[PDB]
Design a protein around this ligand. Structure first.
Ligand SMILES: O=C(NC[C@@H]1Cc2ccccc2O1)c1nc([C@@H]2CCCN2C(=O)CSc2ccccc2Cl)[nH]c(=O)c1O
Ligand SMILES: [Mn+2]
Ligand SMILES: [Mn+2]
Length: 180
């Protein structure tokens, strides 16, 4: 079976994002052909991570997401034993070489207050910065430190709203909203 959401995801995101999401889903044992809504969510979260990395200077952000599980952890230990920063219990998404902290990036279809709370409950690591974006343009970061330029975060937000418009124009937004 081939769904509409699957054919939309492959057309919306660039091929480098799609295969990085496909490899990550199969690496954790889930089929992008069937869990199509999470397929869309990983591509979305992945693109936001890359846009976030493009916000600072050239050699400021180190990307951990998208890598294979073993290599993603390899980079973390290298950073930890370089920076003298505690090794996080869970895999983060980035590392800020300027502010010396790992970053967890969240993208939700719900209230930014709600997801931060559960994101901090599962993290339990006080050092890793948390940064949430929403499909409605809201954002909440830890200690209100949003790290990036206003222009850089704004580019992320408008991209997220474009995705929801394209989903809504294909009637796929309602199913995507009720999947999270
Ligand atoms: O890195 C993460 N997980 C490690 C690997 C990576 C990975 C890929 C596939 C399947 C499993 C899987 O686990 C990670 N996980 C999550 C959420 C929270 C509960 C676990 N989760 C998932 O179900 C992953 S789908 C998803 C949905 C929306 C946005 C982003 C994603 Cl990835 N949100 C993150 O922002 C994040 O970075
Ligand atoms: Mn991650
Ligand atoms: Mn994340």
């Amino acid at each position: 079976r081939g769904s509409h959401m699957e054919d939309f995801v492959r057309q919306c995101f660039n091929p480098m994002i799609v295969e990085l999401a496909e490899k990550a889903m199969k690496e954790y044992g889930e089929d992008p052909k069937i869990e199509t809504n999470k397929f869309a969510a990983i591509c979305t979260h992945l693109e936001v991570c890359f846009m976030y990395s493009d916000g600072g200077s050239k050699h400021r952000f180190e990307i951990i997401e998208g890598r294979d599980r073993i290599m993603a952890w390899t980079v973390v230990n290298s950073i930890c034993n370089t920076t003298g920063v505690e090794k996080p219990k869970f895999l983060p998404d980035l590392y800020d070489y300027k502010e010396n902290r790992f970053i967890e990036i969240g993208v939700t279809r719900r209230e930014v207050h709600i997801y931060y709370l559960e994101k901090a409950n599962k993290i339990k690591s006080e050092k890793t910065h948390i940064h949430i974006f929403s499909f409605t343009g809201e954002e909440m970061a830890t200690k209100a430190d949003y790290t990036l330029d206003e222009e850089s975060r704004a580019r992320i937000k408008t991209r997220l709203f474009t995705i929801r418009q394209e989903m809504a124009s294909r009637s796929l937004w309602d199913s995507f909203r009720q999947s999270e």
